[PDB]
Amino acid sequence: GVLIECDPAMKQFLLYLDESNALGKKFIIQDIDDTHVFVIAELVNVLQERVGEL
Amino acid sequence: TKVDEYGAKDYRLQMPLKDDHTSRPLWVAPDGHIFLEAFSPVYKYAQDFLVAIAEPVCRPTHVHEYKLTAYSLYAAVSVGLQTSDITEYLRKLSKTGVPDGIMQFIKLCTVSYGKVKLVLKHNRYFVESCHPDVIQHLLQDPVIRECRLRQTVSFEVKQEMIEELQKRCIHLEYPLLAEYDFRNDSVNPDINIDLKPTAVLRPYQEKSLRKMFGNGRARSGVIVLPCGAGKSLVGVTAACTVRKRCLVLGNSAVSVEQWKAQFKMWSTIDDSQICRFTSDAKDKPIGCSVAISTYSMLGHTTKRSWEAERVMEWLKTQEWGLMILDEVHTIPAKMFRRVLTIVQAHCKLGLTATLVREDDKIVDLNFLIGPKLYEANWMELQNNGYIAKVQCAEVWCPMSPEFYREYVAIKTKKRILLYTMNPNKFRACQFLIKFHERRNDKIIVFADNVFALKEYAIRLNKPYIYGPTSQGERMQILQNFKHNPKINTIFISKVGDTSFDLPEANVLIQISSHGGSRRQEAQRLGRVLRAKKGMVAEEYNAFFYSLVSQDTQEMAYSTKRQRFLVDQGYSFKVITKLAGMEEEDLAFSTKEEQQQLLQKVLAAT
Amino acid sequence: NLQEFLGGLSPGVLDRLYGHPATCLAVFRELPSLAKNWVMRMLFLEQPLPQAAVALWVKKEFSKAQEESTGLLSGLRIWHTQLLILNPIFRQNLRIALLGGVPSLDKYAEERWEVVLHFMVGSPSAAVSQDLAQLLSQAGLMKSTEPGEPPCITSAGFQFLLLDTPAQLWYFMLQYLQTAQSRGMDLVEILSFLFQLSFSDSLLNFLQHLREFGLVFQRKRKSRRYYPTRLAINQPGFIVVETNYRLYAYTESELQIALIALFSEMLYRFPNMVVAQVTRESVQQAIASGITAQQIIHFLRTRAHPVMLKQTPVLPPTITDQIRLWELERDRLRFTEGVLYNQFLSQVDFELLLAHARELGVLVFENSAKRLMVVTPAGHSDVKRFWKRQKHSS
């Protein structure tokens, strides 16, 4: 997978997109801890657009 | 008009550069913006001249920024500075010449002044003009004919349409003259009002009054001075000098009480001669002349009580020598501006400390009252010690994870109640208040949301003031704050910033903000500017904290709000974390307490 | 630094580089404090001495200076233990070096370096030189990829641009030497000339490149004699920073305006002044180009007008903090390649597998509570085999 280090309060932000996006089967494939998540490789550049509202 | 490769308005081919540019410390942009140097030896003279002919927009420590407009040039001509008298010295001071655009603008603005004069006599407003051609070519549009009631040529005009005609003339390029010749006026006998020697006038107050008093005639205008600078004293002095019937208009009960207190303190006029035309309490308004009332009462649109109706009829019938209006920034509002036409006054002086707003209605003040005669320099007052130096600060509080989760998840506007109440900032304000309480510093907490204010106040068992807060309880709480050592903090709502007589406070915490408004920010900051008896500028005894929540619209609100203060020169220091917060025991530490607070917030609905 | 450059050399090149005219003196001046004296001492001795004497020849206090000097000069190989006599060649050359055996120039150097920087930046008007262009391209601060189109500027280019003139030139010459070895120019011969300055075909080409850089100027239609400029051997500020992110720079040379525009939005340009604004857009544009807040802060500080020198710190804390925060907000999300096995069953058996992927360098993150380990696909054929072996062992 793709190791992504984030904030514990921000981990659930990517989980809401998993239950909303209907592109693939499941966005998040594995959750290590509150500061480590995994992902099919393709949405880091798309997430940069959501920084303006975050 | 010319744009460089960058956002650079190119002026290489626009104006030249003076050879003695180092000697000349003044700049003149074609748009009218002027950049003065605060380090030049002739800085004081340049400051005086530029304040006379222009209005400040940004006055940082090093390079001041001014911009001139038609109203500022009209004020210069009113104080008697001719087109040559200003332009010759402007060219002499300028280190890069004067663009032809600014030259023609100055010439046109100066010449288009004094041609049309508005004089009210026997309750009739005559538009006098020595030159008749001005009227001949001014009667082209039909609005003037429908307005008019159905050498030295003058014609009467309708009372109600004065505002419309004045705003029309402003863009018609023929400003009206509102100068009051109180020296030569026998229709209205002078009032027995004198200024006692006890009152002391500070140099900036005297300078503003001199701008206001161009001659024997009292000019109607707006004087912007910091709240701690003694604008109340300046207004009292203006009324005493006018020596005629004066009607002071506050914005709230606290404002009227403070105005009466200032009148009694600084003027020898007897107590019985001052009345409070206030619904809560009255002192026979018809009995005496000097009156203090409120915009809400005078402009009240619904049914009027019998006694209030009699008082209002008496006020309308009588003519007022002076009409003082505090906090003029609210005047352009519908109901508040209706009061101007409701009441009759020769000169309507305006006093305030934050003459700024978002909607472009501030320009309307120039004709509603008059040109802005003066604006006090907050930094210069701080240096002179008239105003307590303030260490303006913005404490950044990281938002708690769960709270941020719901905040971002919900697209509704419960965020106002959510981010205003988070464990990181709730612990912050509690810890800050504890630190200042043990330091013997007086605290004035601020919060726009009455719900959040009440929750914080009950949790900290402090005397919050807000909404209905009975007047008696308000006064009791303020007296306890001022006197009782056991209590050194008061939690005031938005009512505090409107107009409050409050004791000098060593710190001012703001947990919540109404929005990115430079008016409220400056109004609340002015509370702590009250200079102490023996403080020092470098001691930074006064502190201002604007608590904000990280990664939230509040950050945008705070940035959209500190613009005016940074323009003045205050440097807002960011505080990511506070030392000793972890060791100090505060609520919402463990996850559970944050959970119950979040549940209560959600149930708030 | 020159100490680093000389330390990164072999004994065979070192002794040859220790030429008679200047090298023995230029390398001597490098000796920071004490090695000067000990070397001077044992400049006249033909008999080596024990190491214990050198060890005890410095008091107990400030001994770290002794060890560091001894290590530095051991790296330079000025002496040999021979069991600490100096190298005979260096001793002889040093004895021969010790009683044995302009206003227009500085302006020229300034102008030449300014035009070089103008070419470095996207200036439509600049000096044209194919050799200079290709040298800068191969120096690692520029990439063209298309001879027809003028070369662009790489990320390192902006960082090099924002550096101060001394360090900028020194790094440029370091890269020049490193590329000189690659192109085949003898390093020793060109290096000795730099040392000789502070007191053949390859020499002529090297001097031509130095003249193009502006360090030297023959002034006599490329004669043998040369008059080095001030920069060959090795100013007041003009920017005024406000508290509202406004810069007023007393700049007449287009280079300074270009450098400021690299990380600020220009508003007005007066004959002897220019007004710019340091906004999020410009700062983040520079950061994306490759700059970091440290270079911008250092540049503004070094080009600080005397007016703001009185206040301490010179640069306002609000401006500095805002720039740093803007640079920090740039990076958040990440990227890696991995594979996850699971069901590790026995607790003590999963701990042994964690050391297999950690030693090979294919372990990203682990988990002892759920028995999960992420392994990159690059070393998947080695971890699985180990697991199979462990299973066989049972």
Swiss-Prot record, chain A:
Its main location: nucleus. GO terms for biological process: cellular response to gamma radiation; maturation of SSU-rRNA from tricistronic rRNA transcript (SSU-rRNA, 5.8S rRNA, LSU-rRNA); nucleotide-excision repair; nucleotide-excision repair, preincision complex assembly; transcription by RNA polymerase II; transcription elongation by RNA polymerase I; transcription initiation at RNA polymerase II promoter. It is found in: Nucleus; Cytoplasm. The keyword DNA repair applies. Keywords: Cytoplasm, Disease variant, DNA damage, DNA repair, Ichthyosis, Nucleus, Phosphoprotein, Transcription, Transcription regulation. GO terms for cellular component: cytoplasm; nucleolus; nucleoplasm; transcription factor TFIID complex; transcription factor TFIIH core complex; transcription factor TFIIH holo complex. Component of the 7-subunit TFIIH core complex composed of XPB/ERCC3, XPD/ERCC2, GTF2H1, GTF2H2, GTF2H3, GTF2H4 and GTF2H5, which is active in NER. The core complex associates with the 3-subunit CDK-activating kinase (CAK) module composed of CCNH/cyclin H, CDK7 and MNAT1 to form the 10-subunit holoenzyme (holo-TFIIH) active in transcription. Component of the general transcription and DNA repair factor IIH (TFIIH) core complex, which is involved in general and transcription-coupled nucleotide excision repair (NER) of damaged DNA and, when complexed to CAK, in RNA transcription by RNA polymerase II. In NER, TFIIH acts by opening DNA around the lesion to allow the excision of the damaged oligonucleotide and its replacement by a new DNA fragment. In transcription, TFIIH has an essential role in transcription initiation. Belongs to the TFB5 family. This is General transcription factor IIH subunit 5. It comes from Homo sapiens (Human). The gene is GTF2H5.
From Swiss-Prot, chain B:
It catalyses: Couples ATP hydrolysis with the unwinding of duplex DNA by translocating in the 3'-5' direction; ATP + H2O = ADP + phosphate + H(+). It comes from the Eukaryota. Residues 212-373 form the Helicase ATP-binding domain. One of its GO terms (molecular function) is damaged DNA binding. Keywords: ATP-binding, Cockayne syndrome, Deafness, Disease variant, DNA damage, DNA repair, DNA-binding, Dwarfism, Helicase, Host-virus interaction, Hydrolase, Ichthyosis, Isomerase, Nucleotide-binding, Nucleus, Phosphoprotein, Transcription, Transcription regulation, Xeroderma pigmentosum. The modification Phosphoserine is found at residue 571. Its main location: nucleus. It is found in: Nucleus. This is General transcription and DNA repair factor IIH helicase/translocase subunit XPB. ATPase activity is stimulated by TFIIH subunit p52 (GTF2H4). DNA translocase activity by this subunit in TFIIH is stimulated by XPA, ERCC5/XPG and XFP plus ERCC1; translocase activity is sensitive to triptolide which targets this enzyme. SMART domains: DEXDc, HELICc. InterPro entries: ATP-dep_DNA_Helicase, ERCC3_RAD25_C, Helicase/UvrB_N, Helicase_ATP-bd, Helicase_C-like, P-loop_NTPase, XPB/Ssl2, XPB/Ssl2_N. Changing residue 231 to R: Dominant-negative effect on transcription and NER, induces chromatin collapse, probably has no ATPase activity. No transcriptional activity of the reconstituted TFIIH complex. TFHHI is inactive in DNA repair and in transcription. Residues 427-587 form the Helicase C-terminal domain.
UniProtKB/Swiss-Prot annotation, chain C:
Belongs to the TFB2 family. Component of the 7-subunit TFIIH core complex composed of XPB/ERCC3, XPD/ERCC2, GTF2H1, GTF2H2, GTF2H3, GTF2H4 and GTF2H5, which is active in NER. The core complex associates with the 3-subunit CDK-activating kinase (CAK) module composed of CCNH/cyclin H, CDK7 and MNAT1 to form the 10-subunit holoenzyme (holo-TFIIH) active in transcription. Component of the general transcription and DNA repair factor IIH (TFIIH) core complex, which is involved in general and transcription-coupled nucleotide excision repair (NER) of damaged DNA and, when complexed to CAK, in RNA transcription by RNA polymerase II. In NER, TFIIH acts by opening DNA around the lesion to allow the excision of the damaged oligonucleotide and its replacement by a new DNA fragment. In transcription, TFIIH has an essential role in transcription initiation. GO terms for biological process: DNA repair; nucleotide-excision repair; transcription by RNA polymerase II. The C-terminus (residues 305-462) stimulates the ATPase activity of XPB/ERCC3. Keywords: DNA damage, DNA repair, Nucleus, Transcription, Transcription regulation. Disulfide bonds: none annotated. The lineage of its organism: Eukaryota, Metazoa, Chordata, Craniata, Vertebrata. GO terms for cellular component: core TFIIH complex portion of holo TFIIH complex; nuclear speck; nucleoplasm; nucleus; transcription factor TFIID complex; transcription factor TFIIH core complex; transcription factor TFIIH holo complex. Pfam families: Tfb2, Tfb2_C. It is found in: Nucleus. InterPro entries: Tfb2_C (IPR040662), TFIIH_p52/Tfb2 (IPR004598). The keyword Transmembrane does not apply. PANTHER family: GENERAL TRANSCRIPTION FACTOR IIH SUBUNIT 4 (PTHR13152:SF0), TFIIH, POLYPEPTIDE 4 (PTHR13152). This is General transcription factor IIH subunit 4. GO terms for molecular function: ATPase activator activity; double-stranded DNA binding; RNA polymerase II general transcription initiation factor activity.
